[PDB]
RNA sequence: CGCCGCAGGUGCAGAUCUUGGUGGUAGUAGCAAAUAUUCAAACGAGAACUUUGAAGGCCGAAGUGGAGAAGGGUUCCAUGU
């Protein structure tokens, strides 16, 4: 009952600068994304800039931990999310016109500023990107503007997902199966108050019917797919894991215990990446994943050539209108769709704002 | 499901049922005849007294070898016992019956057990070992139970 | 990308054995992925590689 | 630790590991499991690290 | 008040007379629990482990003739229990049992 | 909750019988978390598991 | 016993391997007619042939 | 299925009949060989029986101890139900 929340105005201001530092590294990512680069190169430099910038901010309070709440995940045209290539793993080269999707997070006092964005690289100045890859990102952008407008204590959790299903049907697309938004509190990215998109019969009865509440942080995340809704595995190593503090077990391995203690020092409860270590890290992760000490964040692939897009950010709830601390660089001038919106409620929410 | 003795007014009635319950049929039949016609609160109190051995059930039909007790004199009888397992199983079915009565919306402070029936269930098989290389049955005697409670006051 | 015995028959003993070596290496990697979790794509490729090995050996014999 | 053919002896296992993974091996121990599969404990040479040989194999 | 405590002495010899050898010490604790139930009116009686050692001090059949105990009625502090009060009975080591009354004790 | 495994491992580590192994009644959860002999060693070092002394069999009367 | 021949140990291996429950997806097959492994064996109840 | 013919492995109360099922007996006989259990706590919906600690006892080194051969064949060991 003593857990910290947005009730402190100091918490508000450190949210604003933490979201600003998360937005500014996404900006450096999109300005440094060019043809002939590597996904691994952009991931390692994206996290390295986070580590040094969070070190130089809040140098006055260092009893706590400042750094990554979600590692720099970079995926292109085939991966849903949770992707961070290892040095021993194969790399990918960025070409002309491919849309790349970047996830990134910062945390201060265990309080999270999380943000993503989907953008096409090497975009010619003053041109229009079309096709079936240009409407999934525009629909997802409309989903993000929908959530920004409608997030308010007084609605239900199913209102968001039915609107997301509706805008999916309007754009002749569908949401990704089993994608969950979370209520983000102190030291937590896995809050119990969760939001579903593209549900099924099994996930619906396991989802909890709940009503929103004032003065709390959310991670509104939308996954829009131009295909059919298929996300599976293709034998790729899962890199991102999160410590589960509820459970414990007696490790039988010296290098697994060393791996776990390295997690406690750097990423004690928040999701991390195996890149930060690596030879013994790959050994020490398989046993800790076996006994559910770490929650794997698996990589998901769709049919080759299909297109999926993401848009997520941390939004603050307050009775006098919600506010945004994390935003991505999307411009609707150079992104249009071959299908427009036909629904009255959708056109009303995109017109109005806080 | 089709009971026997469907209620005269089904709106003011609730039903409960259990099948293949692993209690002795003979004990449960005697306990059911004890609580038949009782009020819901009175029967719940009575069954709790059976487990506390303050009130006994009279063994009227299945009484071969059943001992005598002083508490049998409340009934017009001489033999009585305190079947703990039969009382516990009927207590659970009475809780289920009153939960059904709440679900229908009719109040639970005026219910009376107007129907209660114990049927024999299919027998379960075990083995016992006897003197000269013989095997004999060790059959269990489970029972189905059904009950209907009707509002009356 | 499958292997057809009809196009195998023109090949020589050197490249036929090279193709057999490549298939056997792939199968051994698939068996590794089978015991290390892997994916259904790699699990279902086991039968494809196994029939390809038999196809090459039948052509050789 | 490898599961090997039940008809393979220590010399054959030692040569098979050397050829397939291009690594040296000090000694091979061998048991037959209760379910019938033969299991070999292939101790690598002192200069070969089994920790990273397991990586290039893919069983880390 | 219902958090009272009192010192009693129990004639264990009186309550165990006639019990067989292998059942004397177990019966002494059933009758000690009976004594606390009657004197304090609580169905929940907790024997102290030091009192259990005192009853079994001379073995299963040579139970002490008298024991000096202290019954303490207390609030269970837990409304999830169906009994509001429980009596905890402890062991009072004495050198003699002559002229020992039943007395009230402060906290 | 059920310290059968921990009592067996503590007797093997301490090289005594299960008669002489003293698991702490109050630290039940911490003992129960020890699924390994090295965890047992840590508890022995930290005083949560004690080897009780031999029952006294004096020869003073015989002497 | 601890001492055994290779033939005996291989015989015990097959009996061990086939003494397992049937898969759950077998019940979903078309025209299944199979309820449970009717050839299950317990060491204490039924002794092996050898 | 009726009628005209045809053909039988054609009619059951029995056979200490064959096979299957079900009663009374009957909530009965019984769950009585080798001294013995008790208190507190934990987990748990639920504890005479599980786990821990404290007692009181027994086996008493020809053991109710520690290991093996034959035989068994996974009963070994963790986790869960
Ligand atoms: Mg008679
Ligand atoms: Mg017998
Ligand atoms: Mg016999
Ligand atoms: Mg050998
Ligand atoms: Mg036998
Ligand atoms: Mg005939
Ligand atoms: Mg007949
Ligand atoms: Mg009897
Ligand atoms: Mg008896
Ligand atoms: Mg003795
Ligand atoms: Mg022995
Ligand atoms: Mg065992």
Curated annotation (Swiss-Prot), chain C:
Modified residues (N6-acetyllysine): 18, 42
Portion held of the full protein: 2 to 62 of 123
Keywords carried by this UniProt record: Acetylation, Cytoplasm, Diamond-Blackfan anemia, Disease variant, Isopeptide bond, Phosphoprotein, Ribonucleoprotein, Ribosomal protein, Ubl conjugation
Gene Ontology, cellular component aspect: cytoplasm; cytosol; cytosolic large ribosomal subunit; cytosolic ribosome; membrane; nucleolus
GO molecular function, one term: RNA binding
Lipoprotein in keyword set: no
Any one biological process term the GO annotation gives: maturation of LSU-rRNA from tricistronic rRNA transcript (SSU-rRNA, 5.8S rRNA, LSU-rRNA)
Gene name, Swiss-Prot/TrEMBL: RPL35
Assembly and binders: Component of the large ribosomal subunit.
Subcellular location: Cytoplasm
Family as reported in the entry's similarity comment: Belongs to the universal ribosomal protein uL29 family.
Role this protein plays: Component of the large ribosomal subunit. The ribosome is a large ribonucleoprotein complex responsible for the synthesis of proteins in the cell.
Protein name: Large ribosomal subunit protein uL29
UniProt crosslink position (Glycyl lysine isopeptide (Lys-Gly) (interchain with G-Cter in SUMO2)): 24
Residues that bear Phosphoserine: 28
Disorder cited: Diamond-Blackfan anemia 19: A form of Diamond-Blackfan anemia, a congenital non-regenerative hypoplastic anemia that usually presents early in infancy. Diamond-Blackfan anemia is characterized by a moderate to severe macrocytic anemia, erythroblastopenia, and an increased risk of malignancy. 30 to 40% of Diamond-Blackfan anemia patients present with short stature and congenital anomalies, the most frequent being craniofacial (Pierre-Robin syndrome and cleft palate), thumb and urogenital anomalies. DBA19 inheritance is autosomal dominant.
From Swiss-Prot, chain D:
PTM characteristics: N-terminus is methylated by METTL11A/NTM1.
GO biological process: cytoplasmic translation; translation
One GO CC annotation: nucleus
Impact reported for residue 3 to T: Found in Diamond-Blackfan anemia patients; uncertain significance
Entry's induction text: May be down-regulated by GNL2 (at protein level).
GO molecular function, one term: rRNA binding
Keyword entries, A-Z: Acetylation, Citrullination, Cytoplasm, Isopeptide bond, Methylation, Nucleus, Phosphoprotein, Ribonucleoprotein, Ribosomal protein, RNA-binding, rRNA-binding, Ubl conjugation
Localization of this protein: Cytoplasm; Nucleus
Principal location class: cytoplasm
Assembly and binders: Component of the large ribosomal subunit. Interacts with LYAR and GNL2. Interacts with MDM2; this interaction may promote MDM2-mediated p53/TP53 polyubiquitination. Directly interacts (via BIB domain) with IPO5, IPO7, KPNB1 and TNPO1; these interactions are involved in RPL23A nuclear import for the assembly of ribosomal subunits. Interacts with IPO8.
Family to which the UniProt record says this protein belongs: Belongs to the universal ribosomal protein uL23 family.
Domain notes: The N-terminal beta-like import receptor binding (BIB) domain mediates interaction with IPO5, IPO7, KPNB1 and TNPO1.
Function: Component of the large ribosomal subunit. The ribosome is a large ribonucleoprotein complex responsible for the synthesis of proteins in the cell. Binds a specific region on the 26S rRNA. May promote p53/TP53 degradation possibly through the stimulation of MDM2-mediated TP53 polyubiquitination.
Species, as recorded: Homo sapiens
Swiss-Prot record, chain E:
Gene Ontology terms: biological process: cytoplasmic translation; translation
Cellular compartments annotated: Cytoplasm
N6-acetyllysine carried by residues: 58
Entry keywords, A to Z: Acetylation, Cytoplasm, Phosphoprotein, Ribonucleoprotein, Ribosomal protein
The keyword Phosphoprotein belongs to this UniProt entry's keyword annotation: yes
InterPro entries recorded: Ribosomal_eL31, Ribosomal_eL31_CS, Ribosomal_eL31_dom_sf
Family to which this protein belongs: Belongs to the eukaryotic ribosomal protein eL31 family.
Purpose of the protein: Component of the large ribosomal subunit. The ribosome is a large ribonucleoprotein complex responsible for the synthesis of proteins in the cell.
Full protein name: Large ribosomal subunit protein eL31
Organism name: Homo sapiens (Human)
Taxonomy of the source species: Eukaryota, Metazoa, Chordata, Craniata, Vertebrata
UniProtKB/Swiss-Prot annotation, chain F:
Residue positions, PTM Citrulline: 4, 15, 37
Source domain of life: Eukaryota
MF annotations from Gene Ontology: RNA binding; structural constituent of ribosome
PTM description: Citrullinated by PADI4.
A Gene Ontology cellular-component term: cytosolic large ribosomal subunit
Phosphoserine: modified positions: 12
Entry keyword set: Citrullination, Cytoplasm, Isopeptide bond, Phosphoprotein, Ribonucleoprotein, Ribosomal protein, Ubl conjugation
GO BP, one annotated term: cytoplasmic translation
Compartments in which it is found: Cytoplasm
Keyword Secreted appears in the UniProt entry: no
Keyword Cytoplasm set for record: yes
Function: Component of the large ribosomal subunit. The ribosome is a large ribonucleoprotein complex responsible for the synthesis of proteins in the cell.
Similarity remark: Belongs to the eukaryotic ribosomal protein eL19 family.
Assembly and interaction partners: Component of the large ribosomal subunit.
Protein name (database record): Large ribosomal subunit protein eL19
Phylogenetic placement of the source organism: Eukaryota, Metazoa, Chordata, Craniata, Vertebrata
Gene that produces this protein: RPL19
């Amino acid at each position: 009952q003593q857990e910290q929340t947005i009730a402190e105005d100091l918490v508000v201001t450190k949210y604003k600068m933490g979201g600003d530092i998360a937005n500014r590294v996404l900006r450096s990512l999109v300005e440094a994304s060019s043809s002939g680069v590597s996904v691994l190169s952009l991931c390692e430099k994206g996290d390295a800039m986070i580590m040094e910038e969070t070190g130089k901010i809040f140098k006055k309070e260092k009893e706590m931990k400042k750094g990554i709440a979600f590692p720099t995940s970079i995926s292109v045209n085939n991966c849903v999310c949770h992707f961070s290539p290892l040095k021993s793993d194969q790399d990918y080269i960025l070409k002309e016109g491919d849309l790349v999707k970047i996830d990134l997070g910062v945390h201060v006092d265990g309080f999270i500023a999380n943000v993503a964005h989907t953008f096409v690289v090497d975009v010619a100045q003053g041109t229009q990107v079309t096709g079936r890859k240009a409407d999934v990102i525009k629909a997802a952008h409309l989903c993000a503007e929908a959530a920004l407008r409608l997030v308010k204590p007084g609605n239900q959790n199913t209102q968001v997902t039915e609107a997301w299903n509706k805008v999916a049907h309007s754009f002749n697309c569908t949401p990704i199966e089993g994608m969950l938004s979370h209520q983000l509190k102190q030291h937590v990215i896995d809050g119990e108050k969760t939001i579903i998109q593209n549900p099924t019969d099994q996930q619906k009865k396991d989802h909890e019917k709940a009503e929103f509440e004032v003065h709390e942080v959310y991670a509104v995340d939308v996954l829009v797919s131009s295909g059919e809704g298929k996300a599976k595995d293709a034998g790729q190593r899962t890199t991102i894991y999160k410590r589960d503090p509820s459970k414990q077990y007696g490790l039988k391995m010296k290098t697994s215990r060393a791996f776990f203690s390295e997690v406690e020092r750097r990423f004690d409860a928040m999701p991390f990446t195996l890149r930060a270590f690596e030879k013994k890290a790959r050994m020490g992760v398989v046993e800790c994943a076996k006994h559910e000490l770490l929650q794997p964040f698996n990589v998901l692939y769709e049919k080759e050539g299909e297109f999926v897009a993401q848009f997520k950010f941390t939004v603050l709830l307050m009775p006098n209108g919600p506010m945004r601390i994390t935003s991505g660089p999307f411009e609707p001038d150079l992104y249009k769709s071959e299908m427009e919106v036909q629904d009255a409620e959708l056109k009303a929410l995109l017109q109005s704002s806080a | 499901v089709r009971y026997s003795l469907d209620p005269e007014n089904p709106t003011k009635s609730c039903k409960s049922r259990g099948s293949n319950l692993r209690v002795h049929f003979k004990n449960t039949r005697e306990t059911a005849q004890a609580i038949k016609g009782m009020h819901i609160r009175k029967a719940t109190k009575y069954l709790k007294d059976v487990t506390l051995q303050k009130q006994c059930v009279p063994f009227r039909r299945y009484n071969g070898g059943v001992g005598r007790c002083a508490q049998a004199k409340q009934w017009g009888w001489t033999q009585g016992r305190w079947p703990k397992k039969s009382a516990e199983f009927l207590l659970h079915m009475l809780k289920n019956a009153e939960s059904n009565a709440e679900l229908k919306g009719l109040d639970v402070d005026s219910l009376v057990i107007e129907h209660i029936q114990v049927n024999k269930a299919p027998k379960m098989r075990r083995r016992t070992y006897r003197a000269h290389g013989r095997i004999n049955p060790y059959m269990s005697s489970p029972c189905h139970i059904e009950m209907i409670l009707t509002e009356k006051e | 990308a499958k292997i057809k015995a009809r196009d195998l028959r023109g090949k020589k003993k050197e490249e036929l054995l090279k193709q057999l070596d490549d298939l056997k290496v792939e199968l051994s990697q698939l068996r590794v992925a089978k015991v290390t979790g892997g994916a259904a794509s790699k699990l279902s490729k086991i039968r494809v590689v196994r029939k390809s090995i038999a196809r090459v050996l039948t052509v050789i014999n | 630790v490898f599961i090997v053919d039940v008809k393979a002896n220590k010399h054959q296992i030692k040569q098979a590991v050397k050829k397939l993974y291009d690594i040296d091996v000090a000694k091979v121990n061998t048991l037959i499991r209760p379910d019938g599969e033969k299991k070999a404990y292939v101790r690598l040479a002192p200069d070969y690290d089994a920790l990273d040989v397991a990586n290039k194999i893919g069983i880390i | 008040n219902e958090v009272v405590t009192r010192e009693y002495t129990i004639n264990i010899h009186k309550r165990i007379h006639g019990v067989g050898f292998k059942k004397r010490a177990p019966r002494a604790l059933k009758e000690i629990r009976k004594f606390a139930m009657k004197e304090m009116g609580t169905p929940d009686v907790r024997i102290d482990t030091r009192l259990n050692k005192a009853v079994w001090a001379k073995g299963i059949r040579n139970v002490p003739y008298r024991i000096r105990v202290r019954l303490s009625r207390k609030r269970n502090e837990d409304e999830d229990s169906p009994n509001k009060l429980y009596t905890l009975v402890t062991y009072v080591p004495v050198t003699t049992f002559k002229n020992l009354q039943t007395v009230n004790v402060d906290e | 909750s059920m310290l059968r495994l921990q009592k067996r491992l503590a007797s093997s580590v301490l090289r005594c019988g299960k008669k002489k192994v003293w698991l702490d009644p109050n630290e039940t959860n911490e003992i129960a978390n020890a699924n390994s002999r090295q965890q047992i060693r840590k508890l022995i070092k930290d005083g949560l598991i004690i080897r009780k002394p031999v029952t006294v069999h004096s020869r003073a009367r015989c002497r | 016993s601890s001492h055994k021949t290779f033939r005996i140990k291989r015989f015990l291996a097959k009996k061990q391997k086939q003494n397992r429950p049937i898969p759950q997806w077998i019940r979903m097959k078309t025209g299944n007619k199979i309820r449970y492994n009717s050839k299950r064996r317990h060491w204490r109840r039924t002794k092996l042939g050898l």
